[PDB]
Every structure is written in C-alpha cells, then in structure tokens.
DNA sequence: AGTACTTGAGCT
RNA sequence: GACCAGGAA
DNA sequence: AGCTCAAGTACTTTCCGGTCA
C-alpha cells in the first residue's frame, strides 16, 4: 500500500537493559507457583522473563516509543487474555502508521 | 482429580491397593513414600468440558479496547458497567452465550436462559 | 534497507567470523 | 427410498432414520470416572447408594469404572439407559458387571467393574467403550436426514400427480448393510459411489 | 428511483432485524440446532439465508 | 522525477523484488491430521538475527490421536535420529524430578486436565532418573552412535547447547531459559489439544517479515566474504615461507543482480531465482 | 478487521455489503469485496487448469 | 589390460555404467544428475522424449 | 469509545496502480484488480530526460 | 422372543431369493413356491422353540422343460443350507459326495458365517460338478431386481458363435463382465459364457448389448 | 494444485 | 540454439 | 528380522530478457 514501510532492523539490549530495569524478573530465578499470573514477557521470540505490573510496564514503554525513545519502528503488544508481553525489533516487519 | 507429589522425591504419585484394610494408597517408584489417598477419584475423562469456557479473566480486562461493552446491570455491584465475550473453548459444537465481567465488582455472570452458573 | 545494510549490516559481515592465523578490521566504502 | 407402502408415513421415516444412523457410546457421554470403591456391597459415592441398593435386591474389582450421561443427547439420539448399558452388558459378556440408575432419576449413571493390576485393564476398557461401542446405527452412516421429495407418479385415473414420499438422505455409505434394513425399498435405493454400486449391484 | 430506493433500504433493514434478533435468540442459548449442525452452524445458516434473502 | 532505488549492472536498472518468508524465532502450533500418529505439533524455527544462521527446527508433537490413550510427547533434536521423551530432555537439562519439570510445563497447579495429559510423559521418561544418565540416552541417538560412552554424553551437551533452541544463547548457563521454553512451547502445544487456544493461522501476515535489497543482499555477500575469507586461508598455507582474488566479490554481486539467480554462483540451482529484474519503465506510474 | 470490537457476529463485521455499486462501498464493503474477489481470480485460474487436464 | 588394482577397476566399472545411464536417463531416483559443467544438468535422450515440447 | 487509533485515510489500504483507479469503489472487485494490472501496460512519459 | 424373528425373516428374506435364483437358472420353481409366505416358512423349518432348521431347508431342483432345448446338458440342482454358523470340511466333505453320487451337475452351498479355508478346498474337487458358495447375509436382497439392474441372459454355445459370427469378432472384441461381478454369480456364470443385456434406452427405447465372462 | 502410485523407512 | 527468468486474450 | 505403514517421491497454453560452449 501507499504508507506501508518495512522495519529496518534495530537492536533488542536497550530495551532489554531497559526493560529488566524497569521490574522483569529474569527467567532464571522465576518460579510460576509463586507467582502465577505474571505476564512473561518476550522479545524477538526470547522469553526473558515476567512482570507483575504490566499494564503501568507497557504505558512506559509506549511512552518511550511515542517519545522518541525506544525506536518509532519497535512492536510491543499485551496481549491481556493470554497474559503475554511480545517485542519485536527485527528486520523484515510490515506496518503501516495511524 | 488432583493429585500430588512425594516429600523426598518430588516424583509423582501412582496408586497401590492396601488389600488387607482396603484403602487406596499413593506410592512413590523413586523411594519408599507411601501416603493413604485423599479421594476414591483416581481418574476423570470429560467429554463435554466446561474449563476454559471464561479463560483469561485477569484484572486488566477492563483495559482490552478490542473487548465490547454494555449496560447490562450486574447480579452483585448492580454496575451497568461491563466487558463481554464468547465462550474461550475453542471447540465447535461451543454455544454463543455470552459472559459478562463487572468493570466494579469484577464478577462474572452470562445471558444464559437455559441454565444458571456462578462462572 | 540499503541504506542500513551499508552503513551497519557489511561491517558486522566483515568481522563476525573473519580472523584466520589474519584479522579484518574497519571496512571502507567508496 | 422408503417401503413402497409407508411412503408418506413420515414415523415411518423417523423410524428408520434411528434404524441406520449410526450412535456411539461415546456421544451420549459426559465423562468415565474411576473410583476405589473397595466393597461391591457399599458405595463411597453418595448419590450412587439408590442404583445399589434396587439393581442388588429385587467376587468382583474394588475398581469402579464410572460413567456419566448426557440426558439431552440421550434424547436428540431417543435413548434409555436400559438399552445403551445392555450394549456395554452385551459387549464385555462375562467379565463387566453393570448396573446403571434409571431415566427416571436426577442424574444418568453407568457402574462397571472387573471380573495384583486392575486400574490400567480398566482404562482400557473405558476406551474399548467411548472408541468401539456402537448404540443405534449401521457403521458409516453418520448423518441422516428426512426429505420429502416430490414424486412424479401416474394417478388411478391416468394423469401423473405430484405424490410426495419421505426419503433418507446419508452422510456416509455402506449399501450391502443399509440394502438389507427393513421397511426401506431396496429397489430403489441409490448412492453417489458408483464404485460401492459397482461391487453389490454388478457393473 | 427515490421511493424504490428507500423501500430497498428497508428491505434490508428489516432482515438486519431478523439477524440481529436469531443473534440475540443464539446468545441466550435458546436456538436449538437442526439436525446435524453445530448450535453455530445452524445459527450461521439462518444468517446467511436472512441476509440474501435481503439482496434478492 | 526519477525515484531511484534501483541498481545499474552492466546497463540495464535492475529492481530487488521484496522476499516473503516465514519470519522465525517463533512459536506455532498445528494439528495433524486424521492419519497420522501425531496429534498436534508445536514448531518453532530458531534462528541466529545474524551469525551463520542456523535453520534448525524444533519440533514437539503429541504422539496419540484424540481416541487413542499413551497419548505421549516427543521433541525432535537437531542433529539427533529419534524423536525424545520431553521429560528426558528437562532431566538432560538439569531438571530432574517429575513435577519439577512439571513446574516449567503448566504454571497452574489445579489445571488438573493440563496435568493429566502429563502422566504419561512422565512414566514415559521415568526410566531415566539423572541427568548423566539422560545425557546418555539422548548422544546414544546419533548422528551415528560415537560408540564410546563417555564420547556420546559429551556429545549431547553439545546439541542442546548449541543445536538446540539456538536463539535464547548458544553459550552456556543457561539450561534454565531454555528448559523454561521447552516448558513454554509444551504448555501451548497442550492447550491447542485441550480445545482452550486455536491453532495457528499460518496467513497470518504478522508472523510474515519481507526481506528488502538490504538483507537480500547480506546473505549474499555473507556467502561471498566466507568464500573469500578461505581463498586466503589457502594462498596463505601455499606460502610455508597482497593476491587477495578481488574478482569473487565483484563478479559475484554482479552475477546474482544480472541473472536475479541468488546464489554462488553459476553453482545455484536450487538458488530462488527472479529476486532482481530488469525495471519496467513503459509508465511513470508502472 | 482491527476496526471492529471483538465477537462481532454482525453482517455489516462478516461482509454484508449494503450498498449498490451506484451508492458505493465503504472501506470495509471494499475489503471484503476485495476478499471475496480475490477467491474468484484464484479458483477461476484453477479451473482452467484443472478443466485443461481433463479435456486432454 | 594393464596392472589392474582389481578395485580401480570397479572404480571405472561403476564409473562408465554410470555415464552409459545418465546419457538414456539422467532424472534418476537414486541422487547425483551428471552436470555439464556450469551446473546445467545434460539432457538425457529420455529428457527429449517425455512430452508437451519434446519429440513425440 | 474504546479507541486507540485513527485511520489516517482508507484510500491508503490500496497501491500505486489501484490509486489511479476513479472512484474504485463503485466497481465490481475484480474490474479494479484488472486495470491495475493494465495500466502498467498504457502508454505516456515515463521520464523527463 | 427378542431380536429372534428377525434373524428368521431374514433367513426367510434369503431363502427367497436363493428360490428366485434357482428358478432364474432356468430351473423349475413354480411361483407360489418363491412366494412362499413368512408364516408359512416359520411352521415348516422351525422346532420346538422356533428356532430356524437350516439342515431341512436344503432341496433339490430340475431343469425347466425349456431349459433342457437351449442347454440339454443342464444338470439338477442342489442347494445346502447348513445350521452351523461356521462350516468347515466336516459338514463339507458328505456335501461334495452327495453330489457326485447323485450326479448333480451344480451344487450350491449357502453358509451363515463362513466357510473355512480347509473346507473352501474341496470345492473344485469333484469334476465336471461345480460347485458355489454363497454368503447367506448377501443373499437377502436379490440384487438382480433392482431398478438399475437390467434383465442378462446366458447364451448357449450356439447362441454365442451367432452372435460372434454376425458380428465378425473374436471374443477379445467383446465388452466382458467380471466372474466375480454380483449378476454373474446369480446367473453361475462361467469364464467363455456370454450374457445378452437388455435396457431401456432414452434414445431408442430398448437396447442390445453383450458382455462375456472374464 | 490435489491426487496418483510408488517408493521408502521405521517400529513391535 | 540449449537453459533460466519475467509478463499477456 | 520381517513386516507393517506413514511419509517420502514425480506428474499431471496459443502469443510475445538474461548466460551458456
Ligand atoms: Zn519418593
Ligand atoms: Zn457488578
């Protein structure tokens, strides 16, 4: 179509370090019958870990792209149903601006 | 059903019969646990589910822009305030009832005329 | 696209593998 | 195509609707259940103490095999427990003592045990029941439907006259079976696989 | 022309009607399945038959 | 007027025709159908962002049709001939006993229906009781054999570590992520078999990434630059005492934009083929 | 379409076009024309071949 | 009619059974397709006879 | 009133050739998915120089 | 009482059809006797509970005067109904005999559920006699009155080379019905036989055609 | 492009 | 001339 | 070891720019 764009390709660690610095508990030391409803949050398809506020974690991040911060052409979807927190940043992505 | 593992191993639970005093024990196979049963339920099939029927019900269901609205006052918080969905089976035979979720009081109730739940 | 594969992408190519017993460093384009 | 006769007798029609479509075990039911009900005698399910305490009165596993059944199906299907558990009764012969509550009662059950190791050859048996047990129904036949289809046919007077008959329409087909079920017409009865045609009615 | 085309409009309204009331009557669980469909398949027939029922 | 965004070889304007694929990194699952002995699989295609890319799949399917009881789970390893009991594969990974791995699998403790369809993994993997021991079973499974038994377990930690589930960390210490994963792939395998999440729709346009000019031309010269890279290697072992061959890179680029045959060189039958073509310019617009 | 709540069994959300081609479609009507359409090309330019094949 | 090492001999045995295959047949099941060089599969007499373009 | 996003212009859901095409909505669907294919095939200036 | 009866209608169903066939043959089966009704069956072959005796329901058969012109050489008939669900070459070996003592040119055994593979071998074994099995459940619809099922005719020798003759054709030219085909072992056709089929046709009303034994 | 037959290999 | 690739009633 | 299959294979219209000895 006519606004349709593809992403370039950025990198993930900013997000990462931000993301983390920002209440992810990592993978490493989760432990689902302690806390069971965490959203787990994924970036490029690399489950990192969870977050127990998501929906105050995704105001920032939108935020932070909205602003300038985090790359206008990163994805990030809640899915609230499925509690899942899905980022994308790699090269190859359709989208369109609205 | 509901079943648990063994202290100690951590293994799962198979069932042995006390034939002597008649009772129904759980055994471990990684050691010698052995715990006398909570219930005569050893296993349990169903066929016409109803579990998944309101998956996802978190607290930010309210925050779903997707999910539709409408002011059918609720059983509790008598709120005109609520957010809506099908069945969350995935399965075909599957009616299209509703379920209802207080955007207040957080309870769930349908627009059944069949039938009478609490979830 | 190009763009990025120029500027960013033929570097990293150059030395992710690279280096034999021979190292490729910073790489220049015309 | 129905019996020359009851051609436009539609009980007729429903009649063989329920001869031929085919019904499984597995469709009338809510969910098998295994107990440890240790004493034949005496059961650790409430609900279950009536079922006991008549089809007893006017040796065998402490394993009990249970099963729950769909009243509503038991019904779209026209279905009483006394038939569906002969069939079960039938199935396993000598070595499956059943008993089932009635149609009466508030909830449709199905009791079965046995004749060291018993719980895993009863979940076998539980799959031998909802996979391989057949109720109503020739095998294949899977849907079956009433249509009255209008029927050119000459009056007794000599005008041919629209003269409506109900007919079975098949989802799924075994023609040497359905050939041979009473109160059909086996003259007229036909099928889109020219090669099952081939096989019974010669080339 | 002016009044053919509002009496269209109608038509069509109408059956929206039709549609959205089988809708309420299958969220309510009252439908009852015909012979062989799903309680969905039956209530998508209704459907799709009321809205070219519409059109033509 | 003119836009640009074309290339010039040898003349002729030479157009990079955007590639779909699908993009990988990413978890489906799928039902097999009526004749098969799997029920439901759950993919994922693991991929490098950039490094050699590694085209291994995992697959984890659910032994069983939907009538049938054992209904088991099995993964196949990359560069392993059997398909291997999930449970297996935890305990190889550190995560030894039952309901341990339970945990990774189902993160409710009262999906007793999730759980159930668990027991028999369980019994499955029961015979194998310690890591060392799961290592084993798994690098028994070549490849070949390697016979030799302390060989072949130093042989399975070498897939898992870097042949299976590669994005994540192909490095070390990380059993943890990665049986996390596994755990996570199993838990919406088994929910697509409970009639509680749908399959995947395989159109979905988002799980789809267009590759433009710029990572078209990357792989391309990726392949390029390593064939050039073990030229030296060569004029370098010739030389047991600066004709580095320039040409490779060059006429290489030049080749695929001039055929649109994507791959070294004249070598590239199965390659794609129409990536590049000539630009139409009957229209401004065309 | 992402301009749709969710659970829309609707005909305008599951492709009821309203309008005549005089009055023109809006952007959804469009889309799922389009939809349709497209289905169209595909089995027509099978049917050629499939039907090709069977000739010979 | 030399020295013959009795296995290179097998060698070249296999060797001319094979161009004598692939130059009646070379879309053989069984792997390898006897390449020009340039990559461009030669064409077997077989290749020129299986039809719509080609001999009969 | 839940919404999150505006569509800038429905008009932008087509390409390039199908933008050429005069009042599209107002056509049968395919009759669009052809002449966006034939005015590739038309004739004019394609380049100033 | 139960699901009894209808293994006896069906039985009756059967032995019907197998009257119809014999009689088809070109053996002489009068029309009552085919039309024999349900209630009659019953108290003939039933004992002392009404339990079906298949062991008496056995009969033999001779050739129409008609038939005996077109093929003189079409011998007597017999056809066994056993009472045992499986047969085997007990029961089977005394059938073969009576046969060949008898001088039967044909016999045909109608068996329940099957007939053992050691049975099955003494079936060829008594030359020139030939001998059919036929599946009791397969027997209880006549196939051959169906609505797509057009009348065939066996040929006699004589009959066959006219037709071969007049239209000059080696038997390779002809259209072939199976051996094995449903109307051919009604009609106990053997391979080089040829049947004359007529139709109705939307075209011309009635149509020839032929089709020869495979 | 879905069905054909036919090859192939893996499992009990 | 092989071969590959792209586009038409 | 053999014997069963599912999963593997190749195969099924008229017109009008590049690289290969
Ligand atoms: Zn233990
Ligand atoms: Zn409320």
Redesign the interface.
Do not use: I, N, Q, T
């Given at each position: 179509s006519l606004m349709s764009c593809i992403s370039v390709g950025t990198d993930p660690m900013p997000i990462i370090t931000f993301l983390s610095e920002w209440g992810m508990e990592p993978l490493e030391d989760y432990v689902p019958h302690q806390s069971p409803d965490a959203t787990r949050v994924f970036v490029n398809g690399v489950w990192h870990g969870v977050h127990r506020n998501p929906a105050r974690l995704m105001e920032t991040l939108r935020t932070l792209r909205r602003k300038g911060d985090i790359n206008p052409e990163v994805s990030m979807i809640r899915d609230i149903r499925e509690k899942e927190l899905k980022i994308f940043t790699d090269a190859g992505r359709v989208y369109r601006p609205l | 059903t509901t079943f648990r593992f063994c202290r100690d191993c951590n293994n799962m639970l198979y069932p042995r019969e006390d034939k002597e005093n008649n009772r129904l024990l759980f055994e471990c196979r990684t050691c010698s646990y052995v715990e006398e049963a909570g219930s005569p339920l050893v296993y349990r099939h169903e066929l016409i589910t109803n579990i998944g029927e309101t998956a996802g019900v978190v607290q930010d269901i309210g925050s779903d822009p997707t999910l539709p609205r409408s002011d059918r006052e609720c059983p509790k918080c008598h709120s005109r305030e609520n957010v809506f969905f099908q069945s969350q089976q995935r399965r075909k035979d599957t009616s299209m009832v509703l379920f209802f979720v207080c955007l207040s009081c957080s309870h769930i109730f349908t627009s059944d005329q069949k039938n009478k739940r609490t979830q | 696209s190009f763009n990025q594969f120029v500027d960013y992408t033929l570097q990293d190519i150059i030395c992710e593998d690279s280096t034999l017993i021979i190292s490729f460093g910073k790489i220049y384009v015309t | 195509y129905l019996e020359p006769g009851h051609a436009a007798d539609q009980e007729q029609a429903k009649l063989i609707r329920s001869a031929i479509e085919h019904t499984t075990l597995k469709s009338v039911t809510i969910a098998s259940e295994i107990y440890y009900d240790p004493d034949p005698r005496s059961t650790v399910i409430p609900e279950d103490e009536e079922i006991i305490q008549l089809h007893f009165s006017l040796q065998q596993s402490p394993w009990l095999l249970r099963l729950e059944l769909d009243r509503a199906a038991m019904n779209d299907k026209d279905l009483t427990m006394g038939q569906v558990g002969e069939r079960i009764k039938q199935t396993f012969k000598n070595d499956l003592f059943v008993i089932w509550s009635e149609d009466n009662d508030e909830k449709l059950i199905i009791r079965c045990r046995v004749v060291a190791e018993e719980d895993h050859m009863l979940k076998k048996i539980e799959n031998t029941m909802l996979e391989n047990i057949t109720l109503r129904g020739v095998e294949n036949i899977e849907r079956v439907v009433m249509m009255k289809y209008d029927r050119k046919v000459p009056s007794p007077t000599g005008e041919y006259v629209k003269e409506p008959e109900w007919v079975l329409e098949t989802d799924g087909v075994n023609l040497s079976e359905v050939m041979t079920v009473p109160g059909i017409d086996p003259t007229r009865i036909y099928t889109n696989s020219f090669i099952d045609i081939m096989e019974v009615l010669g080339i | 022309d002016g009044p053919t085309m509002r009496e269209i409009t109608e038509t069509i309204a109408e059956a929206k009607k039709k549609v959205l009331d089988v809708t309420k009557e299958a969220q309510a669980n009252l439908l009852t399945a015909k012979h062989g469909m799903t309680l969905r398949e039956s209530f998508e027939d209704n459907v799709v038959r009321f809205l070219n029922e519409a059109r033509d | 007027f003119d836009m640009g965004g074309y290339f010039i070889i040898n003349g002729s304007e030479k157009v990079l025709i955007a590639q779909e694929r699908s993009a990988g990194n990413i978890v489906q699952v799928f039902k097999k159908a009526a004749p098969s002995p799997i029920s439901h699989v759950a993919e994922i295609r693991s991929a490098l962002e950039k490094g050699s890319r590694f085209i291994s799949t995992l697959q984890v399917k659910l032994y069983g049709r939907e009538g049938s009881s054992a209904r088991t789970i099995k993964a196949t390893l990359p560069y392993i001939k059997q398909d291997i009991p999930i449970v297996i594969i935890f305990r190889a990974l550190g995560i030894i006993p039952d309901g341990e791995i339970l945990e990774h699998i189902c993160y409710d403790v009262n999906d007793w229906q999730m759980l159930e369809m668990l027991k028999p993994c369980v019994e499955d993997g029961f015979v194998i009781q310690d890591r060392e021991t799961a290592l084993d079973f798994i690098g028994r499974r070549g490849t070949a054999l390697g016979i030799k038994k302390e060989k072949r377990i130093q042989y399975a930690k070498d897939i898992l570590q870097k042949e299976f589930l590669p994005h994540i960390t192909q490095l070390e210490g990380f059993e943890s992520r990665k049986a996390f994963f596994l755990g996570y792939m199993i838990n919406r395998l088994l929910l697509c078999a409970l009639d509680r999440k749908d399959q995947d729709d395989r159109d979905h346009f988002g799980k789809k990434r267009l590759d433009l000019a710029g990572p078209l031309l990357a792989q391309l010269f990726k392949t390029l630059f390593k064939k050039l890279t073990k030229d030296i290697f060569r004029y370098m072992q010739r030389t047991v005492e600066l004709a580095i061959n320039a040409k490779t890179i060059t006429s290489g680029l030049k080749y695929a934009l001039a055929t649109g045959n994507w791959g070294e060189q004249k070598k590239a039958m199965s390659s794609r083929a129409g990536v590049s073509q000539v630009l139409n310019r009957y229209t401004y617009s065309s | 379409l992402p301009?749709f709540?969710?659970?829309?069994?609707?005909?305008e959300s599951?492709g009821?076009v309203?309008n005549s081609?005089?009055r023109?479609?809006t952007?959804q009507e469009?889309?799922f024309?389009?939809m349709?359409?497209?289905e169209?090309?595909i089995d027509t330019a099978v049917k050629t071949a499939e039907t090709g094949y069977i000739q010979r | 009619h030399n020295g013959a090492p009795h296995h290179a001999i097998e060698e070249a045995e296999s060797l001319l059974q094979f161009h004598v295959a692939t130059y009646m047949d070379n879309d053989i099941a069984g792997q390898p397709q006897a390449l020009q060089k340039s990559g461009r599969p030669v064409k077997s007499i077989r290749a020129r006879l299986k039809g719509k373009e080609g001999r009969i | 009133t839940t919404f999150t996003h505006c569509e800038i212009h429905p008009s932008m859901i087509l390409g390039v050739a199908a933008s050429i095409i005069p009042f599209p909505d107002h056509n049968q669907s395919p009759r669009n998915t052809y002449q966006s294919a034939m005015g590739k095939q038309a004739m004019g200036v394609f380049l100033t120089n | 009482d139960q699901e009894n009866e209808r293994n006896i209608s069906r039985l009756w169903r059967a032995f019907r059809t197998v009257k119809e066939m014999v009689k088809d043959r070109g053996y002489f089966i009068t029309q009552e006797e085919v039309e024999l009704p349900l209630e009659d069956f019953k108290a003939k072959y039933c004992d002392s509970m009404g339990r079906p005796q298949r062991k008496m329901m056995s009969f033999q058969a001779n050739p129409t005067e008609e038939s005996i012109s077109k093929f003189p050489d079409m011998g007597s008939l017999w056809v066994e109904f056993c009472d045992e669900p499986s047969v085997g070459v007990k029961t089977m070996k005394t059938f073969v005999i009576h046969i060949q003592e008898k001088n039967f040119q044909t016999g045909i055994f109608v068996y329940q559920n099957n007939i053992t593979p050691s049975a099955m071998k003494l079936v060829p074994s008594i030359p020139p006699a030939t001998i059919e099995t036929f599946n009791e459940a397969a027997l209880v619809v006549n196939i051959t009155h169906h609505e797509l099922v057009p009348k065939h005719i066996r040929l006699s020798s004589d009959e066959k080379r006219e037709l071969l003759k007049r239209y000059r054709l080696k038997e390779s030219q002809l259209p072939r019905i199976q051996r094995a085909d449903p109307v051919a072992l009604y009609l106990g056709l053997k391979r080089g036989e040829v049947v004359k089929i007529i139709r109705k046709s939307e075209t011309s009303g009635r149509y020839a055609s032929y089709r020869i034994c495979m």
């Open positions: - | - | - | - | - | - | 301009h709540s969710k659970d829309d069994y609707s005909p599951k009821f309203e081609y005089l023109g479609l952007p469009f889309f024309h389009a349709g359409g497209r169209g090309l | - | - | -």
